[PDB]
Amino acid sequence: ENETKRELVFKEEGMEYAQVIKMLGNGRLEVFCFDGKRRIGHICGRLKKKVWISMDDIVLVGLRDFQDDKCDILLKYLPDEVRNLKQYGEIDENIKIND
RNA sequence: GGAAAAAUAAGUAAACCCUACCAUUUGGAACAACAAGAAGUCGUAACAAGGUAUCUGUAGGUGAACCUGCAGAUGGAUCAUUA
Numbered sequence: 001e002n003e004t005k006r007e008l009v010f011k012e013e014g015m016e017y018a019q020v021i022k023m024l025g026n027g028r029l030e031v032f033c034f035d036g037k038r039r040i041g042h043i044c045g046r047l048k049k050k051v052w053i054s055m056d057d058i059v060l061v062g063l064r065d066f067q068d069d070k071c072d073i074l075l076k077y078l079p080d081e082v083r084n085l086k087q088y089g090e091i092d093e094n095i096k097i098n099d
Numbered sequence: 100g101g102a103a104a105a106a107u108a109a110g111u112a113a114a115c116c117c118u119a120c121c122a123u124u125u126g127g128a129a130c131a132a133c134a135a136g137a138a139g140u141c142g143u144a145a146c147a148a149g150g151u152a153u154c155u156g157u158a159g160g161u162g163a164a165c166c167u168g169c170a171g172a173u174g175g176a177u178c179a180u181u182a
């Protein structure tokens with residue numbers, strides 16, 4: 001089971017990798033960013049449609065210049081995209097991915 | 100005789116204190132909401148006889164809605180049965 005293979009997308013400049021910490025509501029969450037900062041993310045209008053996100057998922061996060069404290073949830077990683085990220089050496093090898 | 104200074108008595112009374120207030124703003128320890136939205140939590144009170152009909156007053160209980168007592172209203176789920 002999976003949605004069609006598409007290229008694992010990396011953190012471009014202005015984005016950061018993140019892991020979901022707790023659930024807020026109104027389509028919001030607290031994320032731990034691999035920037036090293038906690039932020040409060042809002043979920044994309046795109047993602048609100050397609051991909052349901054939950055706790056401890058690994059997500060890509062589009063950042064904001066002005067408010068660093070808020071960030072936008074960009075895309076969710078499939079656990080395979082994640083293990084691949086670890087392979088590539090983008091995100092640290094000690095991280096908990098749950099199924 | 101006139102008359103400056105200086106003094107005198109009573110008054111007008113500014114300003115500064117003490118008391119007690121009113122008005123228009125304002126600083127403030129300590130408390131601390133409300134409306135809107137939705138992919139957080141616990142349950143499911145209400146809409147159907149919401150699965151114990153709701154609802155009003157009151158009173159008591161109580162994670163949460165709510166629950167129970169008494170009197171009341173159909174906005175009721177009855178306009179209606181002496182033989």
Ligand SMILES: [Mg+2]
Nearest residue numbers: 025137139140
């Ligand atoms: Mg809710």
Ligand SMILES: [Mg+2]
Nearest residue numbers: 158159160161
């Ligand atoms: Mg009470």
